[PDB]
């Protein structure tokens, strides 16, 4: 060739020369090929998985037939395409592609770039899967104070606000339940400015109710409870 | 054949940059200032260039890595702006939820 089509196609898809095959080439193995160029429509496609040893039978309207066995397969969009991204995010498990902050400690190190910005908090404290939620940013965070569960302030002075219309619960402020000492997270709930819901049993040492918002609600006389620690 | 080699234009059109914004891995002379794409000749892969102090030159490029001078600094090369991996990386950041309208 004094023709550079292979190069133009290979660089367009960011693959090597040898990873391109043109529709008319019925001699080269398809082994290791990643891009097929359809001469008739002047369109590049990604190649689906194809058994080793195959060659092209034909290529027409988005499909490829290969030998041995004249098997028809659909051609894929290119890796680096709009369609491929949309298809990947649209899979069943597609929510996994949206990132999140892994703890309030990281949220404090994450500056919002737009007012009202949505962020996902995986959990309050790393490795616990408790206390996660969605937060919304205020770039101007003056007036707001970090409370360690529903207002988290950043190093450069924005405020992340937990999206939570009604009551708070100790897990939002870092409670772990089980045998953990949850005094501080329970105390933050009752001091938060909203009623607290107890959803589980929480050990504490001593708790003070100070405001007209310091209501506490559970769902039973046993399972949702405060339990005083033995040494308190 | 000779100077029928349209490599630079092919790399540049593919990344939607100017011819001047391309540099190849073996070019240890041009300054990196204003470059946007580096083409690794040995693996025939284009990559995006991270921020580099002005006045720098390639010392070597190899396996996803750029070594530049002065300072014997190494930096990871980036996926291209218009790639799958760039979009996935962008959404996958801690603040990723912000891209969902
Ligand atoms: Cl989402």
Q: What single DSSP character describes residue B25?
A: T
- Reduced to 3 states (helix: H, G, I; strand: E, B; else coil), residue A21 is strand
Q: State the smallest CA–CA distance between residue B94 and chain A in angstroms.
A: 4
Give B81 Cα–ligand 1 centroid separation in angstroms.
Answer: 23
Q: What residues of B are in contact with residue A17 (Cβ under 8 Å)?
A: 44
Deposited experimental method: X-ray
Residue keyed to tokens 């921020």? B51
- Nearest Cα neighbor of B46 from B30, B28, B64 is B64
Cis peptide before A68 (omega within 30 of 0): yes
Residues of A annotated as binding site for Zn(2+)? 102, 106, 200
- Nearest Cα neighbor of A190 from A165, A226, A221 is A226
Handedness of CA A196, A198, A204, A209 (dihedral sign): positive
Token pair listed for A2: 């004094």
Strands, DSSP E only, in A122-229? 133-138, 151-153, 159-162, 196-197, 201-204, 216-217, 225-228
Rounded to whole angstroms, what are the CA distances from B17 to A73, A80, B4, B82?
35, 16, 21, 11
Residue A225 contacts B, CB cutoff 8 Å: no
Rounded to whole angstroms, what are the CA distances from B37 to A113, A167, B12, B19?
27, 52, 8, 10
Q: Is the distance from CB of A152 to CB of A160 less than 8 angstroms?
A: yes
Q: What residues of A are in contact with residue B2 (Cβ under 8 Å)?
A: none
Rounded to whole angstroms, how far apart are CA atoms A107 and A98?
A: 16
Rounded to whole angstroms, how far apart are CA atoms A191 and A203?
A: 17
Q: What residues of A are in contact with residue B45 (Cβ under 8 Å)?
A: 14, 16
Rounded to whole angstroms, how far apart are CA atoms B11 and A8?
A: 8
Q: What single DSSP character describes residue A159?
A: E
Residue A144 contacts B, CB cutoff 8 Å: no
Kindly determine whether residue B94 and residue A106, on different chains, have CB atoms separated by under 8 Å.
yes
Within a 13 Å sphere around the CA of B77, how many CA atoms are in the beta-carbon half?
A: 26
Beta bridge partners of A181: A203
**Resolution of the solved structure (Å):** 1.9
Rounded to whole angstroms, how far apart are CA atoms B40 and B26?
A: 8
- Cα of A114 vs its chain's centroid, Å: 19
- Nearest Cα neighbor of A48 from A71, A69, A26, A68 is A71
Q: What single DSSP character describes residue A54?
A: -
Is A56 buried (19+), middle (13-18) or exposed (0-12) by CB count in 10 A?
buried
Q: What single DSSP character describes residue A181?
A: B
Rounded to whole angstroms, how far apart are CA atoms B101 and A98?
A: 12
Rounded to whole angstroms, what are the CA distances from B55 to A24, A185, B35, B36, B73?
47, 54, 12, 15, 13
Q: Is the distance from CB of A209 to CB of A190 less than 8 angstroms?
A: yes
Measured distance between the N- and C-terminal CA atoms of chain A, rounded to whole angstroms = 87
Residue of B nearest to A12 (CA): B14
Rounded to whole angstroms, how far apart are CA atoms A184 and A186?
A: 5
Beta bridge partners of A118: A136
- Nearest Cα neighbor of B48 from B77, B13, B7 is B77
A71-74 LR contacts (CB < 8 Å, sep 24+): A73/A48, A74/A48
Beta bridge partners of A138: A159
B contact residues 45-84, partner A, Cβ 8 Å cutoff = 45-46, 80, 82-84
Q: How many CB atoms lie within 10 A of CB B47?
A: 23
Q: Is the distance from CB of A120 to CB of A101 less than 8 angstroms?
A: yes
Select from A8, A97, A134 the Cβ nearest to the Cβ of B92: A97
- Nearest Cα neighbor of A75 from A155, A13, A137 is A13
Strands, DSSP E only, in B5-56? 22-24, 37-40, 45-48
């Amino acid at each position: 060739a004094f023709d550079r089509s292979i190069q133009e196609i290979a660089r367009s898809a960011n693959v090597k020369d040898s990873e391109v095959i043109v529709s008319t080439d019925t001699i080269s193995l398809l082994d290791g090929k990643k891009v097929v160029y359809d001469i008739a429509t002047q369109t590049s496609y990604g190649l689906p998985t194809i058994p080793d040893g195959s060659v092209i039978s034909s290529v027409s309207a988005g499909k490829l037939n290969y030998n041995p066995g004249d098997v028809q397969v659909d051609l894929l969009p290119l890796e680096d395409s709009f369609i491929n991204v949309i298809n990947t995010l649209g899979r069943n498990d597609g929510a996994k592609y949206i990132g999140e902050c892994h703890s309030v400690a990281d949220l404090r190190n994450t500056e919002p770039t737009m007012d009202g910005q949505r962020i996902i908090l995986k959990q309050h404290t790393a490795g616990t899967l408790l206390g996660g939620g969605v937060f919304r940013a205020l770039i101007d965070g003056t007036g707001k104070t970090d409370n360690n569960g529903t207002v988290i302030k950043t190093v450069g002075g924005a405020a992340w606000l937990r999206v939570n219309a009604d009551r708070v619960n100790p897990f939002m402020f870092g409670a772990l339940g089980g045998s953990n000492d949850d005094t501080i997270p329970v105390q933050s709930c009752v001091d938060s400015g909203k009623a607290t819901q107890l959803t589980d049993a929480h050990y504490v040492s001593n708790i003070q109710l100070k405001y007209n918002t310091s209501s506490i609600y559970g769902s039973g006389l046993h399972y949702s409870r405060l339990h005083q620690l033995p040494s308190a | 054949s000779p100077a029928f080699d349209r490599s630079i234009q092919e790399i540049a059109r593919s990344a939607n940059v100017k011819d001047s914004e391309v540099i190849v891995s073996t070019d240890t002379i041009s300054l990196l200032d204003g470059k946007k794409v580096v083409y690794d000749i040995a693996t025939q892969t284009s990559y995006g260039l991270p921020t580099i102090p002005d006045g720098s030159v390639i010392s070597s490029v190899s396996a996803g890595k750029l070594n530049y001078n002065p300072g014997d600094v190494q930096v990871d090369l980036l996926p291209l702006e218009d790639s799958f991996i760039n979009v996935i990386n962008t959404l996958g950041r801690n603040d990723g939820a912000k891209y969902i309208g």
